[PDB]
Each structure stands twice: as structure tokens, then as C-alpha cells.
Amino acid sequence: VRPVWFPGNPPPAHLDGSLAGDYGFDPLFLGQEPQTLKWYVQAELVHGRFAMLGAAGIILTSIGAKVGLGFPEWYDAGKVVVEKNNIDFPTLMVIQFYLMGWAETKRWYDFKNPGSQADGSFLGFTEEFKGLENGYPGGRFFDPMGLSRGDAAKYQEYKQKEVKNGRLAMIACLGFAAQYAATGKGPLDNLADHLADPNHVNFATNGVSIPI
Amino acid sequence: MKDFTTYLSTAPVIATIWFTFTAGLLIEINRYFPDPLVF
Amino acid sequence: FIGSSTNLIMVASTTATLAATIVDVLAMGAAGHGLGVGIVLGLKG
Amino acid sequence: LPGDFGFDPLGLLDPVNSGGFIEPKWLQYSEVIHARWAMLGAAGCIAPEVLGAAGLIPDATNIKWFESGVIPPAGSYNGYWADPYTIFFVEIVAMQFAELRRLQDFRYPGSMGQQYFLGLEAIFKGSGDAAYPGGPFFNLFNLGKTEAAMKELKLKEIKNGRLAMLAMLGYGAQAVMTGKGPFQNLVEHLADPVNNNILTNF
Amino acid sequence: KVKIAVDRNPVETSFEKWAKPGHFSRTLSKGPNTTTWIWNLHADAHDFDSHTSDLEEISRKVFSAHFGQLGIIFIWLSGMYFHGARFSNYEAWLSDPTHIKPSAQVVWPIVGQEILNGDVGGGFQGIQITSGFFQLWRASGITSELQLYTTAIGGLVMAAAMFFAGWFHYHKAAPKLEWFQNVESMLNHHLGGLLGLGSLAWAGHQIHVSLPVNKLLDAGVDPKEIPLPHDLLLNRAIMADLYPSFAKGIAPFFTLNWSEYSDFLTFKGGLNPVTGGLWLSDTAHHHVAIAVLFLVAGHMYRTNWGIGHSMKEILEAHRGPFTGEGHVGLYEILTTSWHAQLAINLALFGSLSIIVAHHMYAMPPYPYLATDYGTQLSLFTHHTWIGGFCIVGAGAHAAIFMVRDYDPTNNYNNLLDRVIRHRDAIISHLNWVCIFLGFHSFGLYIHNDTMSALGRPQDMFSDTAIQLQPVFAQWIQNTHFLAPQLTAPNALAATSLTWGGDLVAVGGKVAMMPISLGTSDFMVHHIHAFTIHVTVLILLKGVLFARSSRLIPDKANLGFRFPCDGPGRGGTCQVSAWDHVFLGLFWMYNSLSIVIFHFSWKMQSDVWGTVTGVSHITGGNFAQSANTINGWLRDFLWAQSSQVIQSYGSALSAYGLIFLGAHFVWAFSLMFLFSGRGYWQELIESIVWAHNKLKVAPAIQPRALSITQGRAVGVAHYLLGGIATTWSFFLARIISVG
Ligand code: CLA
């Protein structure tokens, strides 16, 4: 009935279609347990949201870098930010791990106890750190514009769009990494090189992707 | 998948994983701290 | 090559084995080729 | 059943205690798949030589079939719109789609008419029989409306296909041994039938 | 009717039975109560006869098991090629084989083990290998690391295909029993297709790739400058430039004018003088002949057509007056009992490996092999050990047949029955001849020791005192040296330099010279005969008395593997056939250790060495020293262990460490061999009390090892210790003085 990633095969029994982006893609059966599938749903959402955020950073910085605005390419940006400003590397690393460990540990112990971070123990806040679903923590802070509580069918549509754009940005970020590992260039430089000669500048001309 | 993790919970598999972890931890210590005799 | 010594020995061996189904044709033709190669390479010594 | 002349000396259509890829359902279906690919292979390996012979295509093309870039040690034509690996990835994606949807209709009969494929679902409903889907595109014209006419057309497809499979094996052996194209072998066997045979080219 | 017979989907692919240890045995699936269970779980894991009585399921299990083994071996070969391509000095070695040491293992720089990466030459540092892969790769025409890498990927792909084939032919499409019982068809297909097409395709590879590349390598042209093999296949004009026969093509083949192929299909004999290996043209002709012979042999047995022999008819046709029914019933035995087949195949496979060792030392088939003394010693020793182990295995599985599969109500007055029926005569005669051999062979050594110690060397058995010349072996040697003149007219030289003749040297080292045979060789050969006869005595007694003896009339009901039948009737320890395999293992170790010592000392003394005359590695001391035990003790063991004992602080230090470790393991075995599990069980009782006192007693009850497991652990550590000792000794010695 519903579209499967591989037409003809039935979906597995643990993938029903309740999840956003549920195409029955589990050939290694990594999520047969419901708790492990719950944990993997939240890991998929976190990887997807970081990949969307990082991929928009890649694209905007590369658009600003090809046109002569002085922006670095993303494999040089951390070095030129640490060296341009007087920023020491390890202190910014440790402050990042402080803030990220605070937020991520709150998310961890809200997965472990599914309503517990809204007890008022953090500063005075209550029900603004209560979650709504697994990986969907919409209150007043995380959903300030308030789209998860009106037009619930449209909210399911946004869940589908969020998972699809997130998978697309994950394979896009893997693309940036492998693309730079082969070509040694920024990504929109590679896009301009593909627009110059499409028939002759591609992955079958590097000598790396197919070494024959 | 439950049965595969039950098999991974068996004694020689866990002994292999744990001795790989312990031996690798000792190997990394002896790499970054070469030849400790005292302290 | 047609009409030489080796040609006549091979044809004579194949007719001598086929004179003595598709399976019988294959078996006696393989035996005739073996016997003929033996006689040809043995009359060189 | 199409092409059932009883020629099975090694007994591979035995239904008793069969399994794996040796089954009548897999063997007849692979027989017609090899037959159709070999008909296309025979026509495609002849056609540049006879169209260069008739003077229809230029002499920059009309090369021998093994010099196309199939075997770049045996010669490769430069003048395609891309490198042959750029061609080959398009071939990978395209044949993966085609062959893989065909596999799914073999393993699950009729399964290619439900999930959305840009409106192309009534075309791939298939039949209750592999190797002969039909529908609006695989059988465009209603050819074989009579069941006896359908059997006769299946038998003609079998015989033309087996002849083309023998022809493609002949193109391979001929291309290795004499190093020339098959139409060149036609010209040399029709010029001197006695002095240009397999017995001469040893 | 021979046909494909297969059952569809017998066993579901599921991780369920992975999570239930001992599922295969009704006794072991109950779970563990004592520690004995674990050992039982691993000991009976692959004993498929104890799993099911159904021959079909057993046959399927062994088939997929064999596929697993082949996939493992393909992983191993893949590894060797990959390590030869990425972590070796193979190309550098190709440029200078006589002064670069073959190395294909490198160690990481941690805890000081980096010292093992020694100066092997070629601007490389690693462990010098003695497996001989470099010579095999040069002989095959490989020149670059890329080709080795491609071979590694190919072998990995083939390993994946073999594991898929195993899973497929056990879980998806598993053959029926009457498929496995088509033994006539199996012999036809393996003799034609495997050996025949194997050697045909290899001769194809040789004639088309090996010969030109190695002819250019012997010519002296730089390896990178040599044309790639596909250019040798593609442009036949180059093949005609090296050997003009190739200009005429395959026209002399079909017209039977085969004499024109004498450029690359030769009968030279001897060795390539600039290379020290057999002529690849001789090897090509050899593999072509072998191919044609086996393809002829593979059309012998009747399958789906009238022509062809029938195995049961040939067996039942050979009956005489002395043997009664003769070979009747043997076909039924060898088509229903896997253990009988395994015994035959193990015996011939071991013997074949020993023949491989002798023929590969005597007639070096690879280029720059004879002068890589470490490789020669390693290969000979290795394949001799493998051989011996497979022979002991043959005796083991023969006995297992005798206990589990033997059934005399289909086997009544037969060859096997008469053997069982005069076993006392057989064993008593073997007993006597073993004592005779022991007395006179070993007694000559003790006699010599006594005479030498008493200051009377003129009374010894030696070449200058009382001589015992090997007249028969010398006559066969002389005859085989004179063979090219009269009884083999088309041979240019003899098949091996050791028969007699000149001397082939490469890079200043002796590749092979004529081997002389004197009193010492007479004495060691009769020592070999003695030890082999004793080993045969133990194993054969084990198989003949496996079912019954005057001591234990109902031994068959006690099984193949059991400790004893109690201290009564005087004592019945080690009455089982398994225990006869256990003793045969020790005696096999004894025999083959004396064999490899013979080979090592003799090669270093009378064959190997440098050419200035020839200066041998030990100066030729064999002929005078190998007649006393003190001579072996001092001039072989004591003298040649200098290199191993002073290997510390260099790249050979690992051989010293494994020398000590192997001595340790050998001694460690004696605790298991000399003791018994009653003492150990009581000791474990005391220790268990101590654990109970501190609430750390395990729920799985600590048990001492079984009697038979004590013996098994004993013999395994004994063999590992001794063999590894001789390994470290040999390798350190021959790498340092080579
Ligand atoms: C089959 C025989 C074989 C043997 C004896 C070796 C031996 C070696 N290899 Mg080679 N290798 C082989 C085949 C082999 N290789 C093959 C087939 C390939 C191609 C894939 C390679 C590719 C290769 C590379 C690229 C390298 C080596 C290296 C080495 C050396 C160090 C290995 C190491 O420390 O790994 C690391 C140790 C581990 C990964 C231990 C983890 C073991 C896990 C935890 C066990 C878990 C149990 C589990 C249930 C079973 C395993 C399942 C499996 C699918 C993971 C060692 C000499 C290294 C070397 O030579 O350095 C100079 C090196 O860089 N090998």
C-alpha cells in the first residue's frame, strides 16, 4: 500500500508507517526491538538536524567563497577563524563540550525518563522542557512559532519533510567529505566544473572513484 | 537481532571483545607513554 | 595436407573405430582420434 | 514449452527434486532472456559493417564490433559524447532499474503495478507468466490474439533466438581467431569458399 | 540415472540456534552444570555422526563445512598476496634476487619489537619470509605489486563466493543423499575437470605468460621494461620473436606436426643454469601431458550412457583362491561411510605431501629457490610434518570406521574379515620386525658410541672401519644418472643433479650437486625404516583391535574414545583405538624429527655452501660424525644452535624467544602426560572450599579434565613444543648461515 524503498518486497513487521520517513528500509534488522528503534529514531533525527545545519553552512560559505568576498573554504575555515581572531583552540573546544554536554545530557535523561526534565529543577522552567514525542521537544523554547499544536496533519507533513530533507543533507554532507577527498576543491567549485564540461568533468575522470 | 545480541553476549565473544579492549588500552598507553619503569 | 600420410592415417583410424547414436559417434570418434594421433606420432619414430 | 523438441541430453528440466536456479521456471525464462539479448547482439554486431558496406554511414564509424570500446585492448572508438565509463555509469543505473524491476516481477508476480512509478503502473502489471508480460507497451500491437498464433510467435521467437545465440558465439570465436569482422568473413568465404575456411585460418 | 537431486529450504537461516550453545546434541542442549560441558561442546561440535543417524543430513553438513574451509583458505591466500603487494620488497627482490632477502611481514614500532624489522635489503625493513611465495610469483610471471593486489582482491571475492556457496548448499538448496552417492560421476568430473582442466589451464597460462616473461627475466632486461602479459597474448609477433613456432599458430597442433612446438615444449631436464630452477618449457610440456592424461582418465566410469566402467563390477571381478570373496562389499562400505573415505584420502594425501617434499627439494621447480636455503629447508620440513599428521589422521579415522560403521552381516568372508581374522599374526610379525630393526639399526649407533669411547675407532661401523655401503641405492643412483644415454634417448640431462654429474651454481651458492651415500646414510635410512614400522605397528594395531581383543572382548560397545575399562584384569589403561592414535602421534613426531634432522645436516654438510672449490656450510662432517649419537649431539644440535642462542639483540631474537617458549610448552605437556585427574580433582576440591568460604564459588562446578582430555592436552602441547623448538632452531640457523 504505502511506498517501500524497494518495490515488490514487503516491509518488515517492526516498521509500520507510524514513523516519519518509514519506507521499510531495515535490511540488517537493526531496530527489531521497540526501545532500540526508539533510540535510533532519535539518533536519526539528531544526525539529520546536524547535517541540515552543517550543509546549509557549507553551501552559504561556498557561495560566499566563490564570489570574491574573502570567505574561506570549509576545510580551512576553522584554521583561519582560530588564527584570524586571537581564539585559542582548546578553550573553545572545552566551552563547546560544556554547553553541548549540558544540553545533550538533558536530552539523554529525558530519553531515559520521558517527562522528567520539566520538574522545575532547571532554573524555574516547567513544561518548556517537557517533550512531545521521541525527538520532537516542542514547547515555548524549541518550537517558539508554535506549529506542532495546530493543524496536526500539517505537523505530520512537516515531520515527513524534516526527515526527508535530513536524509538528503546527510548524504549531501557525505558528498562534501568524499567530494573534497577526491577532488581537493570546494564543493561549488566542483559544481562549476560540472557545469563547464558535464560530459567530461565528473567522478569518472578523477582517477580516484574508479581507478581503472 | 535479539538472538544476535544474545550470541554476542556469550562467553568467548565477550572475552574476545574485552581482551581486545584491554590489550588495545595497554598498547595505546605504551605508545603514548613509551617504556614506563617507575612512577 | 589433403591426401598426405597423416590425413590417411587419421581418416582410416576414424573409419576403423566408427565401423566397429550420437554417443557412439562421440566415443568412437574420440577413440579414433586418439589411436590415429598415436599411430601418426609413432611412425615418426 | 516453446521450443520443446525433446533435446535434453543432460536432463535439467526434471521437475522431481529440483531447486535453486535449475528449475524450469528459471531455465525457460533465462533461455528467452539470452535469446533476446543475443538477437540484439547479432543485429548490433552486423549493422555497422553492412551500413559501411552499403555506403550509408561514414568511414569514421562502421568499425568492427569489438573495436567499439567493449575491449579497449582490442581497439576503442573516440568520438562518443563522453568517456566510456561516463557511459557505463548511466548503463549501471539504467540497467539496474530495468533488470531489477524485472526481477521483482519474477519473484512477486504482479507487484509492479501498485507502487507509484510516475503513472507507469498499468504498463507493468505483467501477466500470470514471466517472460511474456504484454500490456500496453511490451506488446503494443495486439499480435497473438489467437492462442495458436501466440504459440507460433513464441516458437518463432525461440528459434530466431537460438539461431542468434549460435551466431553471437560464432562472432566471438570468429573475432578471436581471424581478428576480423563477421561481414568480412562473409566476403572472404563467398570469394574463395575452398581457400578461406576454418581449416585455412589455423 | 545420474542427475541433480536437491531438497528446497531445509534449514531456516536464523540467529536462534547461535544463542543456544550445544543445540546439536541432545545431551549438551540441556545446559551446563559442570565445567566438563564446555570441553564436550567443543570436542563434539564437528562430530556429525553423534548428531544424527541420517546419512543425508551428515553429508550435507560435511559439504557446507568443506565450503567453509575453502573460503578460509581463500582468505589466507588473499592475505598472502595483499601482504606481498603492500608490505614487501618483491619488486626490489625481482631486480636483485641473489642479494635481497624475501620479506613480506613488517612490525609496528611499539615496545621495542621494531628490532624484528631487519635489514633484508632493497631499502626495506621487515621479517624475512621462508614460505617461498616470491619465487612462486616470479615463476608465474608476476612483475608488479598491482597484479598481486588484484590477485588479493580476486581471492577475497572467491572467499565470499565460497561462504555464500556453503550457506546456499546448506540452508537454501541442500543436495540429496543419492547425489552424494554418485561416486562414478564424482571421479569422472574430478579427474577430467579438476586435475585435467586444472593442469590444462595452467599449461595455458605457462605457455602464454610464464615462458616469455621468465625468458626475458633470464635475459636480463629490467622487469618494468618487459611487455605486460596481455600484450603477449594480443600481438603474436612478439611470441614469434622469442619462439618462432608461435608464428605458425595452432596449425601444427591440428595437423599433428607437434615436433615444431619443440621451442617451448622441451625435454631438457636438469636445471636452468643462470637461474637454478627447472626449465619452464619442461614444466609446460609436463602440464600439457598431465592434462591430456587426466582428461583421458576422466572418461572411465559409466554415468548416463552405456559406455564406461562400473566400480562395483571391477571390485567384484578380482577374486582369487587365497582371498575367497575378495573385494566384494567394499563398494558398499566406501559409499556409505565417510570415515573410511577420510582414512583413505588422508593416508594418500599425507604420503603425497611427503613425496612433494622430496621431489621439490631434489628437483627445484622455482627460479632462485635452490639457493634460498632457508626456503628449501622450510618447505621440506613443513610438508613432511603435514604429511605425517595426515597419516596419523588416516589411522584414526580408519579406527573410527572400524568401531562405528563396520557391520559384518553385510561383510562376511571378505578381505577385511580375513585381515581381522588373522590380526594376531599380522601384529606379531610387525612386532618382531620392529624389534629386529630397533636392535640392529640403533645398536650400530650404540656400538659406535662404545667403540669410539673406548679408543677403538677401527672397530666402528663407518666408511673407514667396518663398512656398510648402500650398494642398492648407489646402483639405482648410477642407473638413473646413466639413463639419458640409453633408456631415455630424448633427454638432454638427467632429471635431477643428485644422481651424479656436474654442478649448477647461482650467485656463488650451490644450487644442487651430486649426493653421495655412505655408511651414515645406510644407518639413518634404517633408522627411518624402524621408526616408520613402529608407527605403522601402533596405528595398525589400533585399527585391528578397535572392536575386540583377548583383553577386552566387547571393546566396540565402549566406543572409539574411552579412557579404559577399570583397574581390573591387571589394568586396562589406553586400550581404546583413540589412545593408539595418541601414541602414534608421539612416534610420528619421533620419526619425522629424525627425518628432518637427516635432511638438515646432510644438506648443510654435503650439498649446500659457496663456490669459490666448494666450501660447504659445515665442511663435510656428515660422513664421519653421523655414526655416533654423540656426533649428532655435538656436531648437529650443540654446534648449530649457536645461531639461535646468540640471536638476541638482532632481528632473529624472536627465534630465541620462541626457542625458549617452545622448550617451556614441551615441558608443560609433561604435567598432563605424567599425571592423572584424581589428584587434580581433589586439589580443585580444596580450592573450591576456599572459594566457598568467600562466596565466590561458581554455579558451573569446577571439574578436573577428563582422562582422555588430559592425554589430548598432553600430546597437543608436546607436539607444539617440540615442533616449534625445531622450527626456531632451523629458521635461525639457516637464515643466519644462509
Ligand atoms: C588470513 C591471514 C592473515 C594474517 C595472519 C594477517 C596478519 C596481519 N595483517 Mg593482514 N590482511 C589480510 C590477511 C592476514 N593478515 C587480508 C585478507 C587483508 C585484506 C583485508 C589484510 C589487510 C591488512 C592491512 C591493510 C594491514 C594488515 C596488517 C596485518 C598485521 C597486523 C594485524 C593487526 O594487528 O590488525 C588489527 C587488529 C584487530 C583489528 C583486532 C580486532 C579483532 C576483533 C575485535 C575480533 C572480534 C571477534 C569477531 C566475532 C570476529 C571478527 C569478525 C570480523 C568480520 C571483524 C598482521 C601481520 C597490518 C600490517 O601489516 O601493518 C604493517 C595492516 O596495516 N593486513
Ligand code: CLA
Ligand atoms: C568437473 C567439475 C567439477 C570440479 C572442477 C569439482 C571440484 C571440486 N569438488 Mg566436486 N563434484 C562434482 C564436479 C566437480 N567438482 C560433481 C559432478 C559432483 C557430484 C557427483 C561433485 C561432488 C562433490 C562433493 C561431495 C565435494 C566436492 C568437492 C570439490 C572440491 C575439492 C577441493 C579441492 O581440492 O579443489 C581445489 C579448489 C579449487 C580448484 C577452487 C575452485 C573451485 C571453483 C568453484 C571451480 C570449481 C568448479 C565448480 C564445480 C563449478 C561450480 C558452479 C556452481 C556456481 C554451480 C573441488 C573444488 C568437495 C568440496 O570441497 O566441496 C566444497 C566435496 O566435499 N565435489
Ligand code: CLA
Ligand atoms: C587451456 C588454456 C589455454 C587458453 C585459454 C589458450 C588461449 C589461446 N591460445 Mg593457447 N595453447 C595452449 C592452451 C591455451 N591457450 C596449450 C596447452 C598450447 C600448446 C599446444 C597452446 C599453444 C598455442 C599456440 C602456438 C598459439 C596459441 C594461441 C592462443 C590464443 C588464440 C587461440 C584461438 O584462436 O582459439 C580459437 C578461438 C576461441 C576459442 C574463441 C573463444 C570463444 C569466445 C571468447 C566466445 C565469445 C562469445 C560471446 C557470446 C561473445 C562476447 C559477447 C560480449 C562482448 C557481450 C588464445 C589466447 C595463439 C596465440 O595467439 O598466441 C599468442 C597461438 O598462435 N596457443
Ligand code: CLA
Ligand atoms: C629412548 C627412550 C626409549 C627407548 C629405548 C624405547 C624402546 C622401545 N620402545 Mg618406547 N617409547 C618411548 C621411548 C623409548 N622407547 C616414549 C617416550 C614413549 C611414550 C610416547 C614410548 C612409547 C612406545 C610405544 C607405543 C611402543 C614403544 C615400543 C618400544 C620398543 C621397540 C622395539 C625395539 O626396537 O626393541 C629394540 C630395543 C631397543 C632399541 C632398546 C635399546 C637396546 C640396546 C641398544 C641394546 C640392548 C642390549 C643391552 C645393552 C644389553 C644389556 C645387558 C645388561 C642388562 C647387563 C623399544 C623397547 C614399541 C614396542 O614395544 O613394539 C615393538 C611400541 O609399540 N614405545
Ligand SMILES: CC1=C[C@H](O)CC(C)(C)[C@H]1/C=C/C(C)=C/C=C/C(C)=C/C=C/C=C(C)/C=C/C=C(C)/C=C/C1=C(C)C[C@H](O)CC1(C)C
Ligand atoms: C538506515 C540503515 C539501516 C540498515 O539496517 C543498515 C544500514 C543500511 C547500514 C543503515 C544505513 C545507514 C546510513 C546510510 C547511514 C549514513 C549516515 C550518514 C551519511 C550520516 C551523515 C551525517 C553527517 C553529519 C551529521 C554532518 C554534519 C556536518 C557538520 C556539522 C559540518 C560542519 C562544518 C561546517 C558547517 C563548515 C565548517 O567550516 C567545518 C565543519 C565543522 C566541517
Ligand SMILES: CC1=C[C@H](O)CC(C)(C)[C@H]1/C=C/C(C)=C/C=C/C(C)=C/C=C/C=C(C)/C=C/C=C(C)/C=C/C1=C(C)C[C@H](O)CC1(C)C
Ligand atoms: C540445449 C542444452 C541442453 C542440455 O540439457 C545441456 C546443454 C548442452 C548445456 C544445453 C546447451 C546449451 C547451449 C548450447 C548454450 C549456448 C548458449 C550461448 C551460445 C549463448 C550466447 C549468448 C549470447 C548473448 C546473450 C550475447 C549478447 C550480446 C550482446 C548483448 C552484444 C552487444 C554488443 C553489441 C550489440 C555491439 C557492440 O559492439 C557492443 C556489444 C556489447 C558487444
Ligand SMILES: CC1=C(/C=C/C(C)=C/C=C/C(C)=C/C=C/C=C(C)/C=C/C=C(C)/C=C/C2=C(C)CCCC2(C)C)C(C)(C)CCC1
Ligand atoms: C551415416 C549417415 C550419415 C553420415 C554421418 C556422418 C558423416 C557422421 C560423421 C561423424 C564424425 C566425423 C564424427 C567424428 C567425431 C570425432 C570426434 C568426436 C573427435 C574427438 C577428438 C578428441 C576427443 C581428441 C582428443 C585428443 C586431443 C585433444 C589431444 C591429445 C590427443 C587426443 C587425440 C586424445 C548421413 C547423416 C550423411 C546420412 C545418414 C547416415
Ligand code: SF4
Ligand atoms: S582410571 Fe586411569 S588408570 Fe585407572 S584404569 Fe582407567 S585409565 Fe587406567
